[PDB]
Scaffold this active site. Sequence first.
Site, PDB file in Angstrom:
ATOM      1  N   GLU A 302     -15.299  12.024  33.715  1.00  0.00           N
ATOM      2  CA  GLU A 302     -16.460  11.146  33.536  1.00  0.00           C
ATOM      3  C   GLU A 302     -16.059   9.844  32.859  1.00  0.00           C
ATOM      4  O   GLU A 302     -16.620   8.785  33.174  1.00  0.00           O
ATOM      5  CB  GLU A 302     -17.565  11.847  32.739  1.00  0.00           C
ATOM      6  N   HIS A 305     -14.549   7.337  35.311  1.00  0.00           N
ATOM      7  CA  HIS A 305     -15.541   6.685  36.154  1.00  0.00           C
ATOM      8  C   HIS A 305     -15.998   5.354  35.585  1.00  0.00           C
ATOM      9  O   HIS A 305     -16.532   4.538  36.337  1.00  0.00           O
ATOM     10  CB  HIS A 305     -16.791   7.548  36.322  1.00  0.00           C
TER      11      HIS A 305
HETATM   12  O1  LIG Z   1     -19.145  18.053  38.419  1.00  0.00           O
HETATM   13  C1  LIG Z   1     -18.554  17.828  39.425  1.00  0.00           C
HETATM   14  C2  LIG Z   1     -17.569  18.844  40.005  1.00  0.00           C
HETATM   15  N1  LIG Z   1     -17.148  18.416  41.335  1.00  0.00           N
HETATM   16  C3  LIG Z   1     -17.962  18.663  42.522  1.00  0.00           C
HETATM   17  C4  LIG Z   1     -19.240  19.189  42.392  1.00  0.00           C
HETATM   18  C5  LIG Z   1     -20.020  19.413  43.519  1.00  0.00           C
HETATM   19  C6  LIG Z   1     -19.524  19.128  44.781  1.00  0.00           C
HETATM   20  C7  LIG Z   1     -18.243  18.604  44.912  1.00  0.00           C
HETATM   21  C8  LIG Z   1     -17.459  18.380  43.790  1.00  0.00           C
HETATM   22  N2  LIG Z   1     -18.705  16.589  40.135  1.00  0.00           N
HETATM   23  C9  LIG Z   1     -19.597  15.529  39.675  1.00  0.00           C
HETATM   24  C10 LIG Z   1     -18.889  14.224  39.416  1.00  0.00           C
HETATM   25  O2  LIG Z   1     -18.190  13.663  40.230  1.00  0.00           O
HETATM   26  N3  LIG Z   1     -19.007  13.684  38.101  1.00  0.00           N
HETATM   27  O3  LIG Z   1     -18.285  12.495  37.988  1.00  0.00           O
HETATM   28  C11 LIG Z   1     -20.951  15.469  40.358  1.00  0.00           C
HETATM   29  C12 LIG Z   1     -21.142  16.149  41.545  1.00  0.00           C
HETATM   30  C13 LIG Z   1     -22.391  16.139  42.147  1.00  0.00           C
HETATM   31  C14 LIG Z   1     -23.423  15.426  41.553  1.00  0.00           C
HETATM   32  C15 LIG Z   1     -24.784  15.496  42.199  1.00  0.00           C
HETATM   33  C16 LIG Z   1     -25.745  16.138  41.415  1.00  0.00           C
HETATM   34  C17 LIG Z   1     -27.030  16.304  41.904  1.00  0.00           C
HETATM   35  F1  LIG Z   1     -27.987  16.936  41.168  1.00  0.00           F
HETATM   36  C18 LIG Z   1     -27.337  15.839  43.160  1.00  0.00           C
HETATM   37  F2  LIG Z   1     -28.597  16.006  43.658  1.00  0.00           F
HETATM   38  C19 LIG Z   1     -26.361  15.225  43.928  1.00  0.00           C
HETATM   39  F3  LIG Z   1     -26.663  14.761  45.157  1.00  0.00           F
HETATM   40  C20 LIG Z   1     -25.071  15.051  43.462  1.00  0.00           C
HETATM   41  C21 LIG Z   1     -23.237  14.755  40.348  1.00  0.00           C
HETATM   42  C22 LIG Z   1     -21.982  14.765  39.746  1.00  0.00           C
HETATM   43 ZN   LIG Z   2     -17.082  12.109  39.586  1.00  0.00          ZN
END
Ligand SMILES: O=C(CNc1ccccc1)N[C@@H](C(=O)NO)c1ccc(-c2cc(F)c(F)c(F)c2)cc1
Ligand SMILES: [Zn+2]
Length: 889
Positions: A302, A305
């Site tokens: 995070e 980012h």
């Molecule tokens: O935690 C992680 C772990 N990886 C990962 C998780 C899931 C799929 C693929 C990779 N990945 C986060 C990220 O990249 N953080 O930087 C991330 C991921 C998804 C959403 C999000 C949330 C929601 F509630 C939504 F409705 C949506 F559309 C997207 C937010 C943050």
């Molecule tokens: Zn991310």
Amino acid sequence: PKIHYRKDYKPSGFIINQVTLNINIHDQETIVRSVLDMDISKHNVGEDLVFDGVGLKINEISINNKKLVEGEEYTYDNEFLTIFSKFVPKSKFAFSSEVIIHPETNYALTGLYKSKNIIVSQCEATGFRRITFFIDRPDMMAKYDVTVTADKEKYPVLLSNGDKVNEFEIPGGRHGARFNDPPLKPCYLFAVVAGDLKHLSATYITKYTKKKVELYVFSEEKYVSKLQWALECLKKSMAFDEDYFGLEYDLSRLNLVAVSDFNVGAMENKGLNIFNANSLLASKKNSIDFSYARILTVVGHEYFHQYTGNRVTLRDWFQLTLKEGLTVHRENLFSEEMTKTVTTRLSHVDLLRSVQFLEDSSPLSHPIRPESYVSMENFYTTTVYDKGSEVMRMYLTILGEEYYKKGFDIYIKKNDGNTATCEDFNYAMEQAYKMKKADNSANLNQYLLWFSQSGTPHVSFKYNYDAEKKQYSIHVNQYTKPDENQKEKKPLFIPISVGLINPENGKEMISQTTLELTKESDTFVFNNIAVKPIPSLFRGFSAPVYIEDQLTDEERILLLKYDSDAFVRYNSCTNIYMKQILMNYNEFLKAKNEKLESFQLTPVNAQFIDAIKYLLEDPHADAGFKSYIVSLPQDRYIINFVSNLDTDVLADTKEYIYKQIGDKLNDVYYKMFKSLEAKADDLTYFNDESHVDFDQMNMRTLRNTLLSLLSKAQYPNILNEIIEHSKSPYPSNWLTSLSVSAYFDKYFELYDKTYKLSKDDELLLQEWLKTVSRSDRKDIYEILKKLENEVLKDSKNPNDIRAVYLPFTNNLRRFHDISGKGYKLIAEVITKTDKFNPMVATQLCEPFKLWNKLDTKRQELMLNEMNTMLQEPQISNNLKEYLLRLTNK
Ligand SMILES: O=C(CNc1ccccc1)N[C@@H](C(=O)NO)c1ccc(-c2cc(F)c(F)c(F)c2)cc1
Ligand SMILES: [Zn+2]
Ligand SMILES: [Mg+2]
Ligand SMILES: [Mg+2]
Ligand SMILES: [Mg+2]
Ligand SMILES: [Mg+2]
Ligand SMILES: [Mg+2]
């Protein structure tokens, strides 16, 4: 069912320059007032003004302080607010609205919701529209001025993006805080948090500007003692971006907040990063070892980012891998540097080649930049994240560190403060490439195919050595299987990091070399090669491909023992195992099919077993690496190599191979389990939360891996060791004692003991649930029913549901029971979860992703449950679209 197409991108006919929000949280509802200062863009053609707005209850809407009237001047259909163009001003104007939303009952955890006693937002990707009206897309960059009000006793801590510029009292026991965030941002990075939060804080001084940055980490009061490691990780992340990339944090403050109910791991909202508690909170008494690497990687992710996603943001959602692939790559560089263990990179490869390779050969296969989407929540995939990260890592392999850093800075300096596309990043890399190659004719046009072409390339090798000429040749071919996205696949730019090992002394015979394969095939020739080498191919796993090394097991053993590259050693071991697995699988399959009364199995290679023993007994070899070599490849890696995979036959194959090796090495395993105890379980720093030793944690991993092997083998009196292990202070150890006791009559005694140890920490109890779910128990279905009735109940917490069910789905013998009862059980859970959280319902579909790779009976059983879920009249958009794609409808 609206399909969005990447090629259809067009800028909006409107601009939103300023957002002024008043969010008033009440007991039964939250009132959101919003003024948008807007303008007409150069692309406007007199269209209706259409806002996104999902599930909003309209109190009023106005343009320039004139109340608009439903029907005559606008329509609202619970998804889009349409203001008829005749009522849209032709110059700068103000749009205002007051809506009511209901975070208390927002169990889908998108938009504004309540997690236990914390009000919290999640706006990525298209969740801001569930809070108020907006043109909810990341190229609509605006300034934000946000006021939050709430009951002061329930919600004493109020947070949003930017600087807190006012705090005030409100009659009736309420209070407010105003946050002004002048830098432009997309609305998916908006966040607000309200709750009775406790914190740890520290001050960080940046490396070059010497700015003081206040760092705050927040949790509910019960768990404030678990915040220390996260704060250390944040300091480490800041220093790494400064040291490797020369990048400093630009804001006065950074807040991290843990909440119990979260759809994923964490979210990079600007200055207000919000975390699944399981990815922020830990203590040595109440967390398993895995938590420490998880918090480090997610805090780092995070934080990284802030440049790759926040300061340089996305033009549109088709560019998602530009921020996620690149930030995972930055997170992996960071993690490798902080842990100083080879298993960090190996663990990433292990995940890619099991989970992501399966996805890429499934009906869900897509490139890291897809051409279309329907559900944005379904767009977040291991392909976009982890294959994306390997594609961003290949730039570093190709350029080398100095020119990679040069290209990365070109990207940051050119795009800082703006939206960007994948082409912008490739362009910056290309400028570095021209510099490195010393001609401005060089280009990376072919590299762009990594963004558009789906599927995993296969790279195969042939060799030739002329002893008289001292000339060695590596013939390389690449191939990608056609799929639904491309009928004809083009050759990619594949960088192949290579060494040549002298088999007589184990030494390097050439300097560091990266072959650049850009054609369907090429022959790479080396002169002055004094003896026939063993090639060390794709060092560091230098491209995300299927490697077919065409080496003998004797050659692979020599690399496993003597090569310098951890991945190639691990991969050589993997390849030896896979040859054995495929052979024994087919022998077992034939005996089953032919109903044989007797048959033969090919034994495990004895020299391979000798090499495993050699490495295990080497006191200078790495404990984490040792734990990899005694473990067979993951089931989801194996399945990419077998058609019509019979899961029972594979379970029998694995059992035979583990027994073959254990029959030879169990005494070595036991001796090591005992000799490792003192260092592995050292308690010197048990009460120092800042002191994390990744090598020591790897010794525990090795001990717990060995204990599992010995328990399955019923090694004499190993139950004594299990019982003593249950008394260890370390949860990784005493939870292991529960899972390995599955093979003994003491399982339920340890079940009760470890439950008592776990039940009073929310996250530890979830780790206990996973341990139970994963237990190799013949009565596992009865056990799952007990978890449902006694622990899980009707919890809507995603961590609870995922903990109970996902580990079990990896039980090869029981989840895939030929009755289909495991498929029936998880489909019931998916359908139940889909009523309140469609995103998590689709996560629970994961075991079905391999359905068309199983034997024909299990294919039918899985497909039947998937068709049953598809027939549910109340199925969500998420789940319907996912299952339609997965079942090839
Ligand atoms: O935690 C992680 C772990 N990886 C990962 C998780 C899931 C799929 C693929 C990779 N990945 C986060 C990220 O990249 N953080 O930087 C991330 C991921 C998804 C959403 C999000 C949330 C929601 F509630 C939504 F409705 C949506 F559309 C997207 C937010 C943050
Ligand atoms: Zn991310
Ligand atoms: Mg509503
Ligand atoms: Mg420093
Ligand atoms: Mg990670
Ligand atoms: Mg709970
Ligand atoms: Mg299809």
